[PDB]
Design a protein around this ligand. Sequence first.
Ligand SMILES: *C(=C)C1=C(C)[C@@H](Cc2[nH]c(/C=C3N=C(/C=C4\NC(=O)[C@H](C)[C@H]4[C@@H](*)C)C(C)=C\3CCC(=O)O)c(CCC(=O)O)c2C)NC1=O
Ligand SMILES: *[C@@H](C)[C@H]1/C(=C/C2=NC(=C\c3[nH]c(C[C@H]4NC(=O)C(C=C)=C4C)c(C)c3CCC(=O)O)/C(CCC(=O)O)=C2C)NC(=O)[C@@H]1C
Ligand SMILES: *[C@@H](C)[C@H]1/C(=C/C2=NC(=C\c3[nH]c(C[C@H]4NC(=O)C(C=C)=C4C)c(C)c3CCC(=O)O)/C(CCC(=O)O)=C2C)NC(=O)[C@@H]1C
Ligand SMILES: *[C@@H](C)[C@H]1/C(=C/C2=NC(=C\c3[nH]c(C[C@H]4NC(=O)C(C=C)=C4C)c(C)c3CCC(=O)O)/C(CCC(=O)O)=C2C)NC(=O)[C@@H]1C
Ligand SMILES: *[C@H](C)[C@H]1/C(=C/C2=NC(=C\c3[nH]c(C[C@H]4NC(=O)C(C=C)=C4C)c(C)c3CCC(=O)O)/C(CCC(=O)O)=C2C)NC(=O)[C@@H]1C
Ligand SMILES: *[C@H](C)[C@H]1/C(=C/C2=NC(=C\c3[nH]c(C[C@H]4NC(=O)C(C=C)=C4C)c(C)c3CCC(=O)O)/C(CCC(=O)O)=C2C)NC(=O)[C@@H]1C
Ligand SMILES: *[C@H](C)[C@H]1/C(=C/C2=NC(=C\c3[nH]c(C[C@H]4NC(=O)C(C=C)=C4C)c(C)c3CCC(=O)O)/C(CCC(=O)O)=C2C)NC(=O)[C@@H]1C
Ligand SMILES: *[C@H](C)[C@H]1/C(=C/C2=NC(=C\c3[nH]c(C[C@H]4NC(=O)C(C=C)=C4C)c(C)c3CCC(=O)O)/C(CCC(=O)O)=C2C)NC(=O)[C@@H]1C
Ligand SMILES: *[C@H](C)[C@H]1/C(=C/C2=NC(=C\c3[nH]c(C[C@H]4NC(=O)C(C=C)=C4C)c(C)c3CCC(=O)O)/C(CCC(=O)O)=C2C)NC(=O)[C@@H]1C
Ligand SMILES: C=CC1=C(C)[C@@H](Cc2[nH]c(/C=C3N=C(/C=C4\NC(=O)[C@H](C)[C@H]4CC)C(C)=C\3CCC(=O)O)c(CCC(=O)O)c2C)NC1=O
Ligand SMILES: C=CC1=C(C)[C@@H](Cc2[nH]c(/C=C3N=C(/C=C4\NC(=O)[C@H](C)[C@H]4CC)C(C)=C\3CCC(=O)O)c(CCC(=O)O)c2C)NC1=O
Ligand SMILES: C=CC1=C(C)[C@@H](Cc2[nH]c(/C=C3N=C(/C=C4\NC(=O)[C@H](C)[C@H]4CC)C(C)=C\3CCC(=O)O)c(CCC(=O)O)c2C)NC1=O
Ligand SMILES: C=CC1=C(C)[C@@H](Cc2[nH]c(/C=C3N=C(/C=C4\NC(=O)[C@H](C)[C@H]4CC)C(C)=C\3CCC(=O)O)c(CCC(=O)O)c2C)NC1=O
Ligand SMILES: C=CC1=C(C)[C@@H](Cc2[nH]c(/C=C3N=C(/C=C4\NC(=O)[C@H](C)[C@H]4CC)C(C)=C\3CCC(=O)O)c(CCC(=O)O)c2C)NC1=O
Lengths: 164, 164, 164, 92, 177, 177, 177, 248
Amino acid sequence: MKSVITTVVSAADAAGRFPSNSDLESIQGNIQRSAARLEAAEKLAGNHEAVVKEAGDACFAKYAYLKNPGEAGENQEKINKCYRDVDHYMRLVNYCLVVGGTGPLDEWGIAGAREVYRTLNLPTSAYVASIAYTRDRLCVPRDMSAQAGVEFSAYLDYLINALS
Amino acid sequence: MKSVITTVVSAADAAGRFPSNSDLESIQGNIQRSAARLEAAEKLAGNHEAVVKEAGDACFAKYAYLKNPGEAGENQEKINKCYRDVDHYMRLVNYCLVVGGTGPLDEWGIAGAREVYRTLNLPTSAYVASIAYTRDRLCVPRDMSAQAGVEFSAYLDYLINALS
Amino acid sequence: MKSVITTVVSAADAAGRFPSNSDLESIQGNIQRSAARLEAAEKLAGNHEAVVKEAGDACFAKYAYLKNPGEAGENQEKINKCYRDVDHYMRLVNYCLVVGGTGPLDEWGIAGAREVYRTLNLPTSAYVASIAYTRDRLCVPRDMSAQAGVEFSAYLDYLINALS
Amino acid sequence: RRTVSFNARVARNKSQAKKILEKADEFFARSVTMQYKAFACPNGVYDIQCTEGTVKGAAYEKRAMAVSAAFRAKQASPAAKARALFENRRHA
Amino acid sequence: MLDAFSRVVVNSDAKAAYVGGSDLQALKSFIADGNKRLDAVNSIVSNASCMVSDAVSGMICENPGLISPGGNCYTNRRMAACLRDGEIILRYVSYALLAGDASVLEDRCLNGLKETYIALGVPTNSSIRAVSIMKAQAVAFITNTATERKMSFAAGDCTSLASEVASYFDRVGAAIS
Amino acid sequence: MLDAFSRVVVNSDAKAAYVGGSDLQALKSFIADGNKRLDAVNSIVSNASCMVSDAVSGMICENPGLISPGGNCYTNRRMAACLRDGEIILRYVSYALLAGDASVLEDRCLNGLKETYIALGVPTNSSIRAVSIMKAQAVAFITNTATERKMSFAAGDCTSLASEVASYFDRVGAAIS
Amino acid sequence: MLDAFSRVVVNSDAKAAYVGGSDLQALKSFIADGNKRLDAVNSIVSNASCMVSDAVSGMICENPGLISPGGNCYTNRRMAACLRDGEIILRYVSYALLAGDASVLEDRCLNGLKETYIALGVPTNSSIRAVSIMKAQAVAFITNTATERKMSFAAGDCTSLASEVASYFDRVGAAIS
Amino acid sequence: AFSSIQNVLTDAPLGTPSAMGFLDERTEKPLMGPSEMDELVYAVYKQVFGNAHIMESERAELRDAESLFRYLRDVREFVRALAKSNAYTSRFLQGNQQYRFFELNFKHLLGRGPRSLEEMASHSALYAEGGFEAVIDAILDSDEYAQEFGSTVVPYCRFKGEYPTNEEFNRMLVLKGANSTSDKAGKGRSKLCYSIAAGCSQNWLSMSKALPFGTEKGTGFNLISSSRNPAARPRIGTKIPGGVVFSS
Ligand SMILES: *C(=C)C1=C(C)[C@@H](Cc2[nH]c(/C=C3N=C(/C=C4\NC(=O)[C@H](C)[C@H]4[C@@H](*)C)C(C)=C\3CCC(=O)O)c(CCC(=O)O)c2C)NC1=O
Ligand SMILES: *[C@@H](C)[C@H]1/C(=C/C2=NC(=C\c3[nH]c(C[C@H]4NC(=O)C(C=C)=C4C)c(C)c3CCC(=O)O)/C(CCC(=O)O)=C2C)NC(=O)[C@@H]1C
Ligand SMILES: *[C@@H](C)[C@H]1/C(=C/C2=NC(=C\c3[nH]c(C[C@H]4NC(=O)C(C=C)=C4C)c(C)c3CCC(=O)O)/C(CCC(=O)O)=C2C)NC(=O)[C@@H]1C
Ligand SMILES: *[C@@H](C)[C@H]1/C(=C/C2=NC(=C\c3[nH]c(C[C@H]4NC(=O)C(C=C)=C4C)c(C)c3CCC(=O)O)/C(CCC(=O)O)=C2C)NC(=O)[C@@H]1C
Ligand SMILES: *[C@H](C)[C@H]1/C(=C/C2=NC(=C\c3[nH]c(C[C@H]4NC(=O)C(C=C)=C4C)c(C)c3CCC(=O)O)/C(CCC(=O)O)=C2C)NC(=O)[C@@H]1C
Ligand SMILES: *[C@H](C)[C@H]1/C(=C/C2=NC(=C\c3[nH]c(C[C@H]4NC(=O)C(C=C)=C4C)c(C)c3CCC(=O)O)/C(CCC(=O)O)=C2C)NC(=O)[C@@H]1C
Ligand SMILES: *[C@H](C)[C@H]1/C(=C/C2=NC(=C\c3[nH]c(C[C@H]4NC(=O)C(C=C)=C4C)c(C)c3CCC(=O)O)/C(CCC(=O)O)=C2C)NC(=O)[C@@H]1C
Ligand SMILES: *[C@H](C)[C@H]1/C(=C/C2=NC(=C\c3[nH]c(C[C@H]4NC(=O)C(C=C)=C4C)c(C)c3CCC(=O)O)/C(CCC(=O)O)=C2C)NC(=O)[C@@H]1C
Ligand SMILES: *[C@H](C)[C@H]1/C(=C/C2=NC(=C\c3[nH]c(C[C@H]4NC(=O)C(C=C)=C4C)c(C)c3CCC(=O)O)/C(CCC(=O)O)=C2C)NC(=O)[C@@H]1C
Ligand SMILES: C=CC1=C(C)[C@@H](Cc2[nH]c(/C=C3N=C(/C=C4\NC(=O)[C@H](C)[C@H]4CC)C(C)=C\3CCC(=O)O)c(CCC(=O)O)c2C)NC1=O
Ligand SMILES: C=CC1=C(C)[C@@H](Cc2[nH]c(/C=C3N=C(/C=C4\NC(=O)[C@H](C)[C@H]4CC)C(C)=C\3CCC(=O)O)c(CCC(=O)O)c2C)NC1=O
Ligand SMILES: C=CC1=C(C)[C@@H](Cc2[nH]c(/C=C3N=C(/C=C4\NC(=O)[C@H](C)[C@H]4CC)C(C)=C\3CCC(=O)O)c(CCC(=O)O)c2C)NC1=O
Ligand SMILES: C=CC1=C(C)[C@@H](Cc2[nH]c(/C=C3N=C(/C=C4\NC(=O)[C@H](C)[C@H]4CC)C(C)=C\3CCC(=O)O)c(CCC(=O)O)c2C)NC1=O
Ligand SMILES: C=CC1=C(C)[C@@H](Cc2[nH]c(/C=C3N=C(/C=C4\NC(=O)[C@H](C)[C@H]4CC)C(C)=C\3CCC(=O)O)c(CCC(=O)O)c2C)NC1=O
């Protein structure tokens, strides 16, 4: 799993080395950001079913043709499965804020997803139009902290660059 | 040159990735533990003549047999090469406290030293006794700060361990 | 180039062997079949601008959202690039009838297909909306022979299988 | 990484040859158990001896009791494993 | 590779000198505004998917004979390998903005590149234009003067960080010239 | 290869639970003693070449037939390999103490160690002792109650972290048994 | 590779001759003095660790800029590589003295050595000086005229083995110059 | 066998966690999992293919050898399956000469260059008796591959210090180039071919482009010629007390 602790003890194991002073300096940076990247994950646990309900009904605002037959969401059980695959990502954005790295994003929600979304004829560019709706609707000075904004928006921007 | 920056991007290059949001936390620990390892380094720079004069004759007060015919310090340039080789070592201890990792020690002082000192009959226990003399010469409110003595006496017994 | 002459002499060169009777029995298939697939090579090279005028707008008569601003064909000059890019596929489906294989289709049109359409956000399931119209406009008696309609509709669905 | 503990393609030989001295020993077991049942009921008429069930559909109830009482022969200690080998040999 | 602290060490080891009190006012003033190095390398790699795409697509619109047959990014296998070469160039610049020194850019990227771009027929006069488009886009992300994507920052300047990275894009832009 | 932050999320993907306010108190009680953990890890790795060499030689003086002919630590080739082995075990437990999770020790070191020693004849009755020597020497260097080398610390309580690194030596002595 | 008997039969193979009694009187004296060839090479391999370290440190003595900052015997990293290299050179000239033909020194050790040294930066004038000290201390052990370390031989001249091995040490200087 | 460049100035070699998972009763390996599994696959694709930069529809034909690599975690079996692929013979066999194909097998699968003409001609003796798969499996099932890599690590370019010929280090430095080089830039023709068959050596600037950072890459060149004259007999004399002795 990609974290900030798993890098410095796999780089120590690969050279056969004890954990020296530069490794323990990097754990000290995990204590600094843990007041912001953990506080944003606390906000994305109870208000999660109102940002996932802001996104997908404005995903269909720019993408009107996905309610047409022959495209993806032509019946109601697929739109309710379209609201599942964004609750599957905001649960994974919530996990990688907690562990610090990009581990739950890249090895669960990203790996393999180029080939399922190719074969099953789902457009990736409506996920990009829906994850980025949670970016610009997010403002800092009412909802969350200052450095909780720049950690949450940097993790929405990671899988935007992975899906594109 | 194992540093904190030269390990998190030698792992970002080994998987072909960008600067991750993991690795922007590992330089946030470089901001926190700098002010104990810079202030331990600057104390060593204005006091270095006095600490290697005391460390070098801790070898020769202990080991009087080194002036025998055929031993390590048998003439005056060998005594001058003994005090050079402990002036070199604590210069690298001053370098490791700047870059924050053990990089300048194990590139310039430790790698080769098992093979160099065996061939020239220079004893390892006399090199250890000079460096272990100044490890417990450190007086934690008097000489430097409390946490600044932790950084300075981390690279010292890293060198005592790797030599022994 | 993957065709029947090169595949039997690449495998002969991989084993260090002379061309024996296995190889010569396969180029006899390049005499009995090669009379039929030049009937679609001669048909396509004099007709193609009347094809790609009519093939390309059936994508837009299936997907009219591409001319909206923010999408690909939002101006007239990228409709011309859309009509150009399908004539590359029509010139490469002409070229693969001549050598009788998938040889200049994959290394000139299909290698690098998923990469350059995802960065540019040209959706790959609307490239197949033109060529499935072309596959259903190929009528059996009037356009070409019955065996020529087989080989023309055996390279069209190599491409729409590799585009999904 | 040295010292021939590290090896490959004999490593998939041994997992596909310890079974060849094992499942060609249960072909010995499945057809020497059959050998004395070819003398117990040696014709189509069954004996008084070969009765499993008497009542109640209790043949399933012993089938639940047969397959987990011989599960408790491989579920045995290595001191108890070697007692089953050096002294059942001497009875044979 | 050497970062910005290990550059100062290998200068002083040439003198065999201890790192004194005069060089440490350039390294305490590295870490003083050293939040801003982390607070601006984040605003390259967040937009780095769009940055490589707008780089080479503007390389087409000023040299339109690249997509002619005979041109280098003509077909689909060559347009994909041109797109990932802007990814590798942008990756080793963003290492060097994180490190403070161009040591990892010059040894692991630029060593032997113009030697091999003439060996593959890559037209380097239009590959320079590929670099310098995304040079202009990166220094307006750091300055926060872009039209779209107004990323919220803290108030001050990154006028020296915008020019340190413009020196890094001119190192690759002079290497393949 | 999971650390202690990556244990609470792999207990929560089974429920597909949004990790919120319930289990985040257990990770805020990780970064409370984070500097207490870092002060505890540094004390082992500063004494690690002495911790091994006192342990392996104490195994000889508690079991003097090991250096008889036919013994397992008889010759110089065998004696170097046991010192090599205990330097790996003390390295992997110190990886586990820093991460706070035994999934760096159990996979990279303990997978297949029981079958290797019986294939080489390495007796487990002495290696349960020589692992348990440096188990008791590890809690001396954490709780500062060692006879020599009183290291410099801050005044508080560390008897939870000394018992937590006792449990990693219980994971060693279970697996090699 | 060849030895002193194989060198004769490749000379006769150019003329398709037979190695007869005219050509055999050089080979009948190679076996006649063949005890002294063996008696001379354990005069060298018995003193080979003292011979390398005296020759390398005797080159530092006449050139102290090799151990200043910027010398190519500066750190422990570079000094152990210089000590390894002079042991390799002394190993291959003990093979060549044993065979009686400098084939194996010339293709394995010396072929391509000049290009390694002008790519790594090794000074070749001082490298010739370390070989020329260990040439001079190799003729002292063979003729038993060393100032310490008298070895126990039998009486006679070994003056043609001492100049045969001096020509093997001269090929090392001619190949890196 | 000290080698002052290897774990000092380069990185550490990548690979699987241990070789003790083969002897385990209930596993096959310390199981990595798909974050620390696929970044091992990134270093096998970078090493076996050079920096070829295979596309998504060229990686789609290697799905069967990856899916076996995450079940048997043997690295020797993954390298063997990738060298019999179409993507290995369409890059290194199809448009190249015979000693160009042979000199890249020493680069991609051993991390060294060939030491001899006799070692090189025996690789073409195996081409006559089984084609190119007899060359590839004889490298992989050799003793030199076993006692340097095993099943555990990727076959990397190793600075040994104690090379069996000095010329072996030279051909290793020409074959392995700098970073961001590949194996297609010379148009099919072998780099080391003239120097193997004649017994000469390489060019100093081509070797010193590939040395690691911190190794004085290129100094030491006198401004006269870069190789040796085999026909020259110099006079090298030593001073004794009386005169100068030319022990030639
Ligand atoms: C052989 C006759 C023989 C031994 C060798 C020795 C082995 C042994 N040692 C201990 C106790 C300790 N080891 C410690 C570690 C060190 N001692 C030091 O002074 C330095 C700092 C460091 C490395 C050399 C320490 C501090 C102790 C004392 C107890 C403690 O941990 O504080 C034991 C006891 C283990 C136990 O029974 O709990 C043994 C067996 N003893 C021998 O008999
Ligand atoms: C319209 C029906 C499509 C659509 C088309 C667009 N394609 C654009 C650019 C483009 N197309 C190709 C592939 C083409 N070139 C080749 O050489 C070969 C094979 C031999 C093929 C198939 C490339 C490489 C490019 C980019 C380079 C270029 O423009 O020349 C395009 C312009 C996008 C841009 O600005 O780059 C459009 C609009 N887009 C659609 O949405 C529908 C499906
Ligand atoms: C190891 C000590 C051997 C041994 C070796 C011999 N050395 C011989 C000659 C010799 N040694 C040196 C180096 C020495 N001189 C210096 O000025 C310095 C320091 C700067 C050192 C270390 C030199 C220069 C020479 C002479 C070579 C020359 O003239 O060019 C030697 C020759 C005869 C002799 O002097 O004994 C031998 C045998 N001597 C020993 O007995 C132990 C076994
Ligand atoms: C010149 C280097 C010496 C010196 C040399 C002589 N050595 C003579 C004979 C000799 N040396 C050995 C030992 C040698 N032969 C072996 O087979 C082996 C190892 C397997 C070794 C080390 C032997 C056995 C002999 C032969 C005499 C005997 O058997 O006792 C020798 C006599 C001439 C000859 O018979 O070849 C000479 C002159 N003596 C010197 O004064 C210089 C310093
Ligand atoms: C004093 C504590 C010792 C002692 C030491 C001697 N050291 C001798 C040489 C020496 N020291 C080093 C390591 C040093 N050089 C470096 O460049 C660096 C790092 C930048 C370090 C730490 C080396 C490599 C050498 C050998 C080369 C040289 O002469 O400079 C030395 C002379 C060796 C000889 O006798 O031939 C001595 C005597 N002497 C003592 O008594 C205690 C053990
Ligand atoms: C030491 C306190 C023991 C002891 C140890 C011996 N081990 C020997 C060989 C050996 N040990 C291991 C396991 C080691 N390697 C690893 O990679 C890891 C963890 C990841 C560990 C713990 C292996 C794989 C091997 C085989 C490789 C080799 O032989 O070098 C050994 C030598 C056996 C021999 O010479 O045949 C010894 C003596 N023996 C003892 O008495 C104490 C209890
Ligand atoms: C238990 C083992 C000890 C004890 C431990 C405490 N240590 C405390 C604080 C502390 N330790 C360090 C250095 C540590 N942090 C780092 O970032 C690095 C290396 C990169 C290391 C080695 C620091 C910075 C601190 C914080 C205090 C300060 O800044 O001065 C501590 C205080 C609470 C805490 O912050 O953890 C305790 C209780 N004290 C004991 O009673 C036993 C013997
Ligand atoms: C010492 C007398 C010299 C000197 C030597 C250095 N050599 C360095 C590296 C090196 N040397 C060789 C040649 C050697 N190895 C062989 O295998 C054979 C023949 C069988 C020979 C003669 C090689 C191949 C290498 C590079 C391989 C490696 O070490 O990994 C070296 C290191 C340079 C550096 O750190 O950048 C040094 C210092 N240098 C001197 O100044 C004296 C004169
Ligand atoms: C989908 C229909 C199934 C399912 C499939 C999974 N298979 C997984 C791994 C896997 N599959 C195979 C068989 C296939 N791959 C080959 O290379 C060959 C022979 C050429 C065949 C027939 C193998 C050998 C493997 C192991 C290699 C690997 O680990 O990928 C798999 C992943 C499990 C894992 O990561 O351990 C899945 C999910 N599973 C299902 O539930 C549906 C029914
Ligand atoms: C953690 C994830 C998370 C988000 C992405 C946002 C998203 C978000 N916005 C609103 C809802 C709102 N949010 C705002 C705030 C603003 N509108 C603006 O244009 C200003 C820039 C900004 C002031 C800071 C306002 C004014 C509303 C009410 C109007 C609306 O429906 O948007 C709500 C409904 C409940 C609530 O008000 O919190 C949610 C979930 N909030 C979150 O909790
Ligand atoms: C760069 C790092 C650095 C160090 C590690 C120290 C090392 C050091 N200590 C002392 C010197 C001293 N240090 C002390 C202090 C103490 N002695 C004890 O017995 C107690 C343990 C402790 C009190 C807490 C005393 C009393 C002296 C004088 C005794 C002496 O001459 O060593 C001296 C001689 C100069 C002087 O007298 O001040 C030096 C160089 N100084 C440094 O500049
Ligand atoms: C021939 C066809 C053609 C194109 C494809 C575009 C390509 C293009 N875009 C920009 C210009 C730009 N590109 C970006 C980058 C971005 N902008 C955003 O809104 C995103 C956040 C991000 C990725 C898409 C920005 C911000 C500018 C404006 C200049 C700047 O602010 O740096 C430039 C100017 C670079 C320069 O001056 O050298 C060019 C050539 N222009 C063309 O003429
Ligand atoms: C782990 C990831 C990680 C980050 C992303 C950064 C996040 C970050 N940036 C800044 C802080 C800052 N960032 C800026 C930067 C700017 N303001 C502007 O108006 C300019 C446009 C732009 C220049 C590029 C400035 C000026 C400060 C405050 C001064 C300073 O301390 O540098 C701060 C300090 C808080 C503050 O001072 O307000 C933090 C934590 N740090 C991290 O550890
Ligand atoms: C780490 C260092 C490093 C790099 C910098 C890149 C450099 C690089 N690019 C290419 C390969 C290529 N590079 C380009 C690039 C371009 N052509 C153009 O028209 C544009 C001007 C320009 C970029 C947009 C193209 C088109 C190819 C493909 C050539 C081919 O297919 O043979 C190759 C050959 C790879 C191979 O196929 O084997 C290499 C090494 N790769 C690296 O490994």
